[PDB]
């Protein structure tokens, strides 16, 4: 469960927000080293659950290799093409919709696995997915929000809360469940088919919440076929119990993949 930090070679910085670096493990294996900002996380709680998130293995989940326990380190799978949000916004890729659908299926596969384990992501969004050197999308930082201490992010009334990815029952009552992950998944499909535009682009968070409370929704990205739009729209039913499962969403996505080509 614990990785010896002396086995790490740091090679390049990948981002600061704490700090993420590219490096090697025992000379050979590529890794991401996440160096957590002091005071930013409930580290004891994180460490205890870290023991659980490593048994969470799936080809479409960014793999947790271990932790170093200042700053403590989270060592994970390295994803050469970075976060899905920036990849989507690189217009040079000139994606086909078949590739976009495959991105959606990648995430849906990961989320069905998490569902089968009764594990919530709680912050699913394109900014929390990564792309590897082969172009496969995997979902990262699942469950992480439970241990972030910043209160602009903890609470539904927070300036950093994922308002645009939250169902009505989350915005009004903080009711989290599998179906708030389902809702967020549908917004993620919208992000993917919109090549990474911000959901509810011309609205504030507060306008977005009123719009959702009123029963109005995101509409169809240009690159989305009717059958793809139907899939994402189904994640946004006002009644949580009316929303599909990730198993059902996976079948719907597989069906459309067949029908395109
Ligand atoms: O990992 C995050 C944010 N989450 C986070 C969570 C806990 C602690 C810390 Cl410090 C950060 N961002 C980085 C930015 C740079 C590009 N990234 C990667 N590139 C390439 N491979 C990779 N593997 C994992 C991340 C990764 C994502």
Swiss-Prot record:
Mutagenesis or variant effect for residue 34 to R: In XLA; complete loss of kinase activity
Effect listed in the UniProt record for changing residue 83 to S: Found in patients with chronic lymphocytic leukemia; uncertain significance; results in resistance to ibrutinib therapy; results in a protein that is reversibly inhibited by ibrutinib; disrupts the covalent binding between the enzyme and ibrutinib and
Tissues showing expression: Predominantly expressed in B-lymphocytes.
Annotated phenotype, changing residue 127 to Q: In XLA; severe; disturbs ATP-binding
Modified positions (Phosphotyrosine) in chain numbering: 153, 219
Description of post-translational modifications: Following B-cell receptor (BCR) engagement, translocates to the plasma membrane where it gets phosphorylated at Tyr-153 by LYN and SYK.
Motif (CAV1-binding): 183-190
Outcome of mutating residue 243 to H: In XLA; severe
Binding site residues for dasatinib: 76-79
Function: Non-receptor tyrosine kinase indispensable for B lymphocyte development, differentiation and signaling. Binding of antigen to the B-cell antigen receptor (BCR) triggers signaling that ultimately leads to B-cell activation. After BCR engagement and activation at the plasma membrane, phosphorylates PLCG2 at several sites, igniting the downstream signaling pathway through calcium mobilization, followed by activation of the protein kinase C (PKC) family members. PLCG2 phosphorylation is performed in close cooperation with the adapter protein B-cell linker protein BLNK.
Assembly information from the UniProt record: Part of a complex composed of EEIG1, TNFRSF11A/RANK, PLCG2, GAB2, TEC and BTK; complex formation increases in the presence of TNFSF11/RANKL. Binds GTF2I through the PH domain. Interacts with SH3BP5 via the SH3 domain. Interacts with IBTK via its PH domain. Interacts with ARID3A, CAV1, FASLG, PIN1, TLR8 and TLR9. Interacts with MPL/TPOR.
Disease as annotated in the protein's UniProt record: X-linked agammaglobulinemia: Humoral immunodeficiency disease which results in developmental defects in the maturation pathway of B-cells. Affected boys have normal levels of pre-B-cells in their bone marrow but virtually no circulating mature B-lymphocytes. This results in a lack of immunoglobulins of all classes and leads to recurrent bacterial infections like otitis, conjunctivitis, dermatitis, sinusitis in the first few years of life, or even some patients present overwhelming sepsis or meningitis, resulting in death in a few hours. Growth hormone deficiency, isolated, 3, with agammaglobulinemia: An X-linked recessive disorder characterized by growth hormone deficiency, short stature, delayed bone age, agammaglobulinemia with markedly reduced numbers of B cells, and good response to treatment with growth hormone.
Descriptive protein name: Tyrosine-protein kinase BTK
